Structure 1
Amino acid sequence: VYLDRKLLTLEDKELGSGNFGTVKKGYYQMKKVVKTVAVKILKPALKDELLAEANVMQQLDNPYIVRMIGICEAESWMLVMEMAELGPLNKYLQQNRHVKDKNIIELVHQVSMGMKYLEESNFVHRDLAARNVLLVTQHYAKISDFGLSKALRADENYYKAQKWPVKWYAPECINYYKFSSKSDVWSFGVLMWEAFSYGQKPYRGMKGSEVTAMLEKGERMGCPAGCPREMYDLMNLCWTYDVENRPGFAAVELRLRNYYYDV
């Protein structure tokens, strides 16, 4: 699973940035052809997180999850993934306002199919958000950034923690530090919110502690100008306060599969 630095070229246009360091476009010389890749380049432990991300990515084989080519012990540590060229789903819709809405259903479904796969595989993402949905084509998205993910113990249905996208986290993650596919389901509702908001941030202006209060009050995000009906009704079901009543991806994909067909 290790790669030859010499076989890898990096364009200077940094693709983006995060705590680990930067991500650059690059090209990796394969058997015979070259592959366009996106490469996480690691700038005091971030390493372990990165290899954790690669470990997870290494066991995932599914059409709606970004594929990892390998790792490169080169100048810095590098995680090389197959390139999703259109990039993050939020930034994209932020400047493709006039994208149909029926196109979005098909997209969030794919997300849910990838997320089902992840549920069944008993892995929890823990950072599910539109920004982590990468576009291959305008009609093909994949889930990325498994830096927080965890493989679940065979004996439990949740991971328990000992810096958080609070606005994407379910109440139980915040109250008890408990992360399950159901928590990912909550996030998937915030993701759907974003998508159907053509990339608007959720809970605009609010602080985490204030988002936390609003949800406990039984309040949820308003419907985004233009969203269909069931899609908002799906969001609210995803945002079920009680874990055990909240639908799993098995369920949420199932409904998702249909609704689209009828559009």
Structure 2
Amino acid sequence: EVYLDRKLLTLEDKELGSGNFGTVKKGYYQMKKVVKTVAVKILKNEANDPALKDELLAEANVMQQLDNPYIVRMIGICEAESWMLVMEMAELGPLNKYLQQNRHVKDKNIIELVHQVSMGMKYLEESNFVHRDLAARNVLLVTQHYAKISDFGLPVKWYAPECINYYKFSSKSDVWSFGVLMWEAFSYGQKPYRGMKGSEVTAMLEKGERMGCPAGCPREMYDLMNLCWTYDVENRPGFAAVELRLRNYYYDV
């Protein structure tokens, strides 16, 4: 039953995150003999907009009809003192913030994590789902060796050129964002195109220029980022090609 019993759920007073339309808190959902740690998105509806409740429910339906090990999964919905979306807890939080704080993580560890992300993306691609906001801030870590894609806003610097010029989003558009995500990861959560305005990024890319190889980044991986950054979408690989290339590389090394 996706509808959860409120008596079985206990929340912490502190918020992990917040926004205009919701708050995320840590909680515990009571199960048979064990207790499960969960993240709960509590809806904030200060203008009493029935469309807001429908969005929370639409988002829960997607989480459910989109289920894979490399995506944040839905536990259920809880119609309590507020509408709540209960999901798995990704303890370590966002990838970019994690890497900024843990400079000891090795290049091998970062290949394993982005390969998992390429696995969740290969999955959304097969379901004909376009994320549109893939970035390191939307990869949440369960452990240092286990990443899950999330979609908080279900960002010009993560956009493929054909998104800016023609607003054409596709899985190949998501492949370009994945390339920026890999650059963020091997850079340890550094901001891409730092200090540049979104217009300067566009002009830089149309000159055939791309971000350099981050320090310590294996060359093979930088080569994959550059392929993710192929200007002409026709020639840009999809996620099946990207994931397979990552898989082989991670299984060899």
Q: Is the 8 A contact 2:157 2:192 kept in 1?
A: yes
Q: Is the 8 A contact 2:77 2:85 kept in 1?
A: yes
Question: Shift in Å at residue 22 of structure 1?
Answer: 1.7
Question: Shift in Å at residue 237 of structure 1?
Answer: 0.5
For structure 2, which runs of at least 5 residues remain unmatched after alignment?
45-49
Question: Shift in Å at residue 45 of structure 1?
Answer: 4.7
- CA distance change for structure 1 residues 47 and 176 in 2, over 3 Å: closer, same or farther? farther
> How big is each residue's C-alpha offset from its partner over 1:19-43, in whole Å with a ceiling of 9 and x where there is no partner?
4322111111234432110111222
| Counterpart secondary structure, 1:94 | helix
Of stretches 31-40 and 239-248 in structure 1, the one that deviates more from structure 2 is 31-40
Of stretches 90-99 and 46-55 in structure 1, the one that deviates more from structure 2 is 46-55
Question: Shift in Å at residue 146 of structure 1?
Answer: 5.9
Q: Take 1:178 and 1:48, find their aligned partners in 2: how far apart are those partners? A: 27
Q: Is the 8 A contact 2:70 2:120 kept in 1?
A: yes
> How big is each residue's C-alpha offset from its partner over 1:151-209, in whole Å with a ceiling of 9 and x where there is no partner?
xxxxxxxxxxxxxx111111111222221111111110010011101111111111212
> How big is each residue's C-alpha offset from its partner over 1:96-153, in whole Å with a ceiling of 9 and x where there is no partner?
0011110110110000011101101111111111111111111111111264xxxxxx
Question: Shift in Å at residue 86 of structure 1?
Answer: 1.0
Identity %: 100
Of stretches 133-142 and 211-220 in structure 1, the one that deviates more from structure 2 is 211-220
For structure 1, which runs of at least 5 residues remain unmatched after alignment?
148-164
Q: Take 1:54 and 1:66, find their aligned partners in 2: how far apart are those partners? A: 11
Of stretches 247-256 and 46-55 in structure 1, the one that deviates more from structure 2 is 46-55
Of stretches 11-20 and 225-234 in structure 1, the one that deviates more from structure 2 is 11-20
Aligned counterpart for 2:195 among listed residues 177, 181, 205 = 205
Question: Shift in Å at residue 51 of structure 1?
Answer: 2.8
- CA distance change for structure 1 residues 50 and 171 in 2, over 3 Å: closer, same or farther? farther
| Counterpart secondary structure, 2:137 | helix
Q: Take 1:49 and 1:171, find their aligned partners in 2: how far apart are those partners? A: 29
Of stretches 204-213 and 230-239 in structure 1, the one that deviates more from structure 2 is 204-213
Q: Take 1:186 and 1:50, find their aligned partners in 2: how far apart are those partners? A: 28
Q: Is the 8 A contact 2:138 2:152 kept in 1?
A: no
- CA distance change for structure 1 residues 6 and 90 in 2, over 3 Å: closer, same or farther? same
Question: Shift in Å at residue 48 of structure 1?
Answer: 4.0
Question: Shift in Å at residue 214 of structure 1?
Answer: 1.5
Q: Take 1:243 and 1:50, find their aligned partners in 2: how far apart are those partners? A: 33
Of stretches 20-29 and 49-58 in structure 1, the one that deviates more from structure 2 is 49-58
CA RMSD in angstroms comes to 1.6
| Aligned match of 1:183 | 173
Q: TM-score, normalised by structure 2?
A: 0.92
| Counterpart secondary structure, 2:71 | coil
Aligned length: 246
Of stretches 135-144 and 19-28 in structure 1, the one that deviates more from structure 2 is 19-28
Q: Take 1:171 and 1:85, find their aligned partners in 2: how far apart are those partners? A: 34
| Aligned match of 1:49 | 55
Question: Shift in Å at residue 6 of structure 1?
Answer: 2.1
Q: Is the 8 A contact 1:119 1:181 kept in 2?
A: yes
| Counterpart secondary structure, 1:179 | coil
| Aligned match of 1:62 | 68
- CA distance change for structure 1 residues 76 and 214 in 2, over 3 Å: closer, same or farther? farther
Q: Is the 8 A contact 1:53 1:146 kept in 2?
A: no
| Counterpart secondary structure, 2:244 | helix
Q: Take 1:235 and 1:49, find their aligned partners in 2: how far apart are those partners? A: 34
Question: Shift in Å at residue 65 of structure 1?
Answer: 1.1
Q: Is the 8 A contact 1:168 1:190 kept in 2?
A: yes
- CA distance change for structure 1 residues 18 and 146 in 2, over 3 Å: closer, same or farther? closer
